[PDB]
Design a protein around this nucleic acid. Structure first.
Lengths: 389, 140
RNA sequence: GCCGGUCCGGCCGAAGUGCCGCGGUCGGCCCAACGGGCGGUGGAAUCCUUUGCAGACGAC
RNA sequence: CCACAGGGAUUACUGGCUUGUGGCAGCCAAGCGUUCAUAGCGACGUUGCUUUUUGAUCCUUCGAUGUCGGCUCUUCCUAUCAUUGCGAAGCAGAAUUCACCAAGUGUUGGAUUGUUCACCCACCAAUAGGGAACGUGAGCUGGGUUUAGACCGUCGUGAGACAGGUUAGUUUUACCCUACUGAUGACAGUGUCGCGAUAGUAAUUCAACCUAGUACGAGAGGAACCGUUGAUUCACACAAUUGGUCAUCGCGCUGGUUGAAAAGCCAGUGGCGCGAAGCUACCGUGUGCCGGAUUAUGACUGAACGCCUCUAAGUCAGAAUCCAAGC
RNA sequence: AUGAAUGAAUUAACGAGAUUCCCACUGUCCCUGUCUACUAUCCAGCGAAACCACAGCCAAGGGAACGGGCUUGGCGGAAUC
RNA sequence: GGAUGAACCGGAAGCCGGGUUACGGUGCCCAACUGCGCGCUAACCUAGAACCCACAAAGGGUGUUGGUCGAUUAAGACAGCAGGACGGUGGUCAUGGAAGUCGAAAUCCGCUAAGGAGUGUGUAACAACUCACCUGCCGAAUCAACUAGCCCCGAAAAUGGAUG
RNA sequence: UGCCUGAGCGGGGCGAAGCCAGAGGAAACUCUGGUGGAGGCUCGAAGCGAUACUGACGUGCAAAUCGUUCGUCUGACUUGGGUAUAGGGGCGAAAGACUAAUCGAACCAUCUAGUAGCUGGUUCCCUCCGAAGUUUCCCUCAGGAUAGCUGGAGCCCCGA
RNA sequence: GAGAAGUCCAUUGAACCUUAUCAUUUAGAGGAAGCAGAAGUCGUAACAAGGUUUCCGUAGGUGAACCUGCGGAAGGA
RNA sequence: UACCAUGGUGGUGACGGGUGCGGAGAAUUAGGGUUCGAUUCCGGAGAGGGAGCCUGAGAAACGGCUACCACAUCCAAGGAAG
RNA sequence: UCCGUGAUAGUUUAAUGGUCAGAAUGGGCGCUUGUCGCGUGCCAGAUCGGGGUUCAAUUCCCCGUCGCGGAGCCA
RNA sequence: AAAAGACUUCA
């Protein structure tokens, strides 16, 4: 050996380490899908805030196995994804020291949004008329400065990127009023056309509906829920130590061997847990829509039935969804009311995975827990109530 | 390559949480004459450090006869798990559980070693082992 | 004639960084890269208070 | 039953030297394998490598190096058990047998025994071996060993003794430095968004279906590649559902108490019985890749040596491994 | 290398005595979770000891053959919780 | 001086100053040569007197250089490619069977310019093709053998790579 | 450990002596109901003891403590006070147990500044020369002893 | 005036599980040697006053058949 | 079933246990007894095990129900069904 | 495994001073006796294996195989 | 008033 003996896989990953506070509260992508499609109408990412979880029934697809064709449940995360202001076009250069931004062209209108951008972001909580953000030049003197910058940019072939922010007062459950700034790359066809489309995209907002199609495979990036500080069992998934009693209980035995007389970095030790960056890949985007006013929702008998995307009474500790929304398959990183960023899937084959969509039957809507379903149930509850309902 | 062989199934089709570990005692769902089994092993699990092999609905098992046929007390014989008290989650999304934990004792051919069943079988087991299924009075 | 700051602009430069030219002006044949002043002319954040998506304190 | 002065001047003991012993290898190849040294098996003899058994020594400690075994937890080697790619066969399939490259990931759960070791049982793809002060007591455990009590056997006149067996028989310390995990944190003209030198690693494997009752085969039996499904194992994450909890809060029922019902108290830190948001896992539920360069090897073009030759100058492919892809 | 008052055998009752089996049961275990309490943490106040020749990075090597420091290599923004 | 280093080398030391040296060293770290003439190695062999410390053997190697000796050569070699071989007689033994081609005699000649009773492939056995020798085409060295150097091979270990 | 003299043991369970009735037998004595209650008896309070977590504590609350568990609890019991027996002696249901935190021989003071071939330490400068780790003896090998190795101080004038 | 489904109290008063025990069929913890076949060993008891006359209660004790102490008997000299 | 009395029975066998229907009768044997007790005649009893009920003059019902259990059966597998 | 302690005929077991070896039982042969047995006369060893010393070794040393006893702490 | 024991099976 030496020992022992009866030997195990080692608990809790090393590619998911350091298990440590993330530097900022809002996730940050180090790489993007490739330019293999349409021009910078294709913004390479979008953002929202996680509302909770709901659930869906869908008409499926596969055929190889025993259960088939037909209705299934699959689990859903709801995100409120209001339209986000692409404020400015950022010009990145390839250099042999990495990318370097050159100059940035700005819309005429961010204007509570830059005051929110000056709130941690910069600091001191926005009361009588401050921080300050610089004003625009005289119009077409400043537009010729900008269009001379466009000239250099669109001759020397900049790898085009966008500054965008979340106009947060379109969410309700964070009762908070502050903008969240991000760097999103713009990807597409040829580089001149790519600058042109990015220019025509900063001089007006962008919704989810212009970057992601329903069913599409999206990589979702967030920062985990924080615990605080923890021991090894709930921070790396190590065993409790068993006897009835013991002068150490949830403990590692040795944090090394006699040699190495120095505790290795790879040993499972206590510390902070949660608030970790993560990219979680290949999420099938089951619906995008709006409370209304886009759809409709679902249909009367049948396909399947009308359900506003909230559980009634609201998503616990969030709120009521009532705006633009994104239903994403399964888990999505974070708590509830945290910035989550969505990016087109990185793994270009490009393939299966998903392909075909998948009739929305139920959303869930609930109405359940002692009562339900909506409409006829609410009528039935009101009959038994009757002065407090 | 594998020392042989067969048994380890096909895609079940559903999700089961393991309910019967090593040394668990279990109903015999046939009339072979066995009438209480003891589970020793599962055809196809691999475990780890300090932890019991546990078995579930649809596993092909070896079990030994704690009560039961003359061919049986204290023979060690193959078996299939037909019912379990710990919930199973279907593709639809319903959870099913049974009253009892039960298996049938099986031939190396995968047929029952008894003439007839007792109690229901989950259809999921019946799919997998169709010569257990074609003795089954009720399928759920 | 030959050089040195300059007004006004372009090319590597994609930053830091530089150079080189159409028409003239202050000049020739100490202090560049840093600075340290006596002087003229000219155009924010921590805290606080209440909270948390955050949290042992601090931090966010 | 001990005590004292000392000694690592000298033992047990860990370490170090050695490496006879042990483990593994090469060479040679008598010989056996129907015939055939080299599919396989392989003696005598012979040269080595390892340092992980044993022995030897007495360098280190006796103003003190905590013992065996176990557990958990990190890391490694390769002489590779499986998995990848290979070559040969006494490789018809096909189970296989031997061997090459190769350490990425796996290498289990139990019955007896303190055991290490080992025996046994079902498993498995297979359930590899070897180091890290026999890794691991300022972690644990405390069964053996190894105090003081006692029995038996053997020996002894006896006290008492045994590498003879047995029952009982204790586990101290508040971390100064250092190490890492995790949180803070000046200089500099500012906050924020970023880049990315570089640092860590994430996917492993199985079953079954398509193919096909085909190939191959007298027959018996019984394959492959993709294409499909699912699950063992690992990782990250969320909590719609199912499952736990639920010492917010509201109900049944005591005993005793506030005169009495009514409304309350105490009986644990919830009297007991019944159940939620949040947190969580019963594997709850969601999410895990082509290209480039190589090894062994199989080839192309090809001389030295007019021929032949896979390589020597050049080149085409080729591993779960390397780089990238990617966090 | 059993053996008869160094007592042999045998044996009901008794036992915080030694070993083993079964049913009942169960968080010991699969495999961990939530929850209470007092600690912890932070605040005011009170206020200690052990210990201390020593400055105090890692990998190798060397050396009385088990280096925080020699030697060569490699790393390190202090301070503080 | 030897990376470090009780006992290896130089050297035996009052203190200081200057000069020149010893051992050993002269690409940088590090003063001082990227010194000269020549030759071998391409494995990163390899930067090493000595050392518990620097390993590498028996045995093997058309890697490469070098030395030598014998024989064969323009009375034409070595190799390759191409071309010639009738008859005695289907060679005597032995044996289902050799009959060129299991095993074992025996290897001569007529007829001939060359032309062995034959080198490897055969079918149960019977069935054909090549080849000894000789010749052309080609044109220059070839082959045998001793000896030696270096390198290569044998060559697997444990926290991380080095001759400091 | 003994002696003297006091004191303490909720409550419950089981049911020995033997005798009544009812009943049998010639007697002997027997059956069934029943009464009464014996006990180093049982389950357990005051009280005693101290098995287990091999827990908590382990510079403690404590120089052996705390919590929960467990044993005894009318007896060879427990316990207050008055009180015997004193150091190779006492006391011991005998373990080398116990004799004021001290027991295979108490504590105190003295002899006493024991004695140690063993460990440790032994305090100002400089100069000239400069070691031995070998040999015999020795109850001798961790020492002595006697040369061997040294060094000073004097006296004199060969030697490879 | 009749009085459906029906719900309650009381009673006769099923069947599974709670006893606890007895019985039967059984097997069986572990263990004693009662008879037997002929093909065994040990001694020679009893069998003739059996070479110590038999038998008997009783205890002791012996390889065992048995022996003997005490008392009794004649199925005994 | 209330209340009051504590009883009543058994050495002529009570209470209890086991038993490979009771009578009319069968078989024997010269007679006496032994044996046998049954299918038939007669009376009683039970209809898979057990309790209860309606109906009807009469049932506590093999060819009625209720319905627990035991066990077969039908299934368009809901429920019936003996 | 260390210190102690032995061996002699088929079997159990005496013995010496260096020159000399026994017993009992068992067994082999007769006699008892009709025949066995009880009894009665008669008989018969390389002193464990092994080497050395000496005039002469069963006897005196050294080794070894076996069978015995007795020790083997403080873990 | 006695030293002293045995003596295969079926016929």
């Amino acid at each position: 050996m030496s020992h022992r003996k009866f030997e195990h896989p080692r608990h809790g990953s090393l590619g998911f380490l350091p298990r440590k506070r993330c530097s900022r509260h809002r996730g940050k992508v180090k790489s993007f899908p490739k330019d293999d499609q349409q021009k910078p109408c294709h913004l390479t990412a979008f953002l929202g805030y996680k509302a909770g979880m709901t659930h869906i029934v869908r008409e499926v697809e596969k055929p190889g196995s025993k259960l088939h064709k037909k209705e299934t449940c699959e689990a859903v995360t709801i995100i409120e994804t209001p339209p986000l202001v692409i404020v400015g076009l950022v010009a990145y250069v390839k250099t042999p020291r990495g990318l370097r931004t050159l100059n940035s062209v700005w819309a005429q209108h961010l204007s509570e949004d830059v005051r929110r951008r000056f709130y941690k972001n910069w600091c001191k909580s926005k009361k009588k008329a401050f921080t300050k953000y610089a004003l625009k030049y005289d119009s077409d003197a400043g537009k010729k400065e900008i269009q001379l910058q466009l000239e250099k940019m669109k001759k020397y072939a900049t790898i085009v990127r966008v500054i965008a922010h979340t106009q947060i007062r379109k969410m309700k459950g964070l009762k908070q009023k502050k903008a969240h700034l991000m760097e999103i790359q713009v990807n597409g066809g040829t580089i001149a056309d790519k600058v042109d489309y990015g220019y025509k995209f900063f001089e007006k907002e962008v919704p989810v509906e212009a970057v992601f199609q329903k069913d599409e495979m999206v990589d979702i990036i967030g920062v985990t829920k924080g615990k605080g500080y923890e021991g090894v069992v709930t921070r790396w998934g190590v065993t409790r130590l068993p006897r009835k009693t013991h002068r150490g209980l949830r403990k590692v035995a040795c944090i090394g061997a006699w040699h190495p007389a120095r505790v290795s970095y790879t040993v499972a030790r206590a510390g902070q847990n949660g608030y970790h960056h993560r990219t979680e890949m290949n999420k099938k985007i089951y619906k995008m829509g709006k409370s209304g006013q886009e759809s409709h929702e679902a249909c009367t008998e049948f396909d399947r039935t009308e359900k506003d995307i909230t559980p009634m009474g609201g998503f616990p500790h969030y709120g009521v969804v009532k705006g633009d929304y994104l239903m994403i398959k399964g888990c999505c990183v974070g708590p509830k009311k945290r910035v989550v960023t969505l990016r087109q899937s990185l793994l270009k084959q490009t393939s299966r995975l998903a392909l075909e969509e998948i009739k929305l039957k139920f959303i869930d809507t609930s109405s359940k827990f002692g009562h339900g379903r909506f409409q006829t149930t609410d009528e039935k509850q009101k009959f038994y109530g009757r002065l407090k309902a | 390559m594998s020392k042989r062989g067969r048994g380890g199934s096909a895609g079940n089709k559903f999700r089961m949480s393991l309910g019967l570990p090593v040394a668990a005692t279990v109903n015999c769902a046939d009339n072979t004459g066995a009438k209480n089994l003891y589970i020793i092993s599962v055809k196809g699990i691999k475990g780890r450090l300090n932890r019991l092999p546990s078995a579930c609905v649809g596993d092909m098992v070896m079990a030994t006869v704690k009560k039961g046929k003359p061919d049986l007390r204290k023979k060690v014989m193959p078996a299939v798990i037909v019912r379990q008290r710990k919930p199973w989650r279907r593709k639809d999304g319903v959870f099913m559980y049974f009253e009892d934990n039960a298996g049938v004792i099986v031939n190396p051919k995968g047929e029952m070693k008894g003439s007839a069943i007792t109690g229901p079988i989950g259809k999921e087991c019946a799919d997998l082992w169709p010569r257990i299924a074609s003795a089954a009075n009720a399928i759920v």
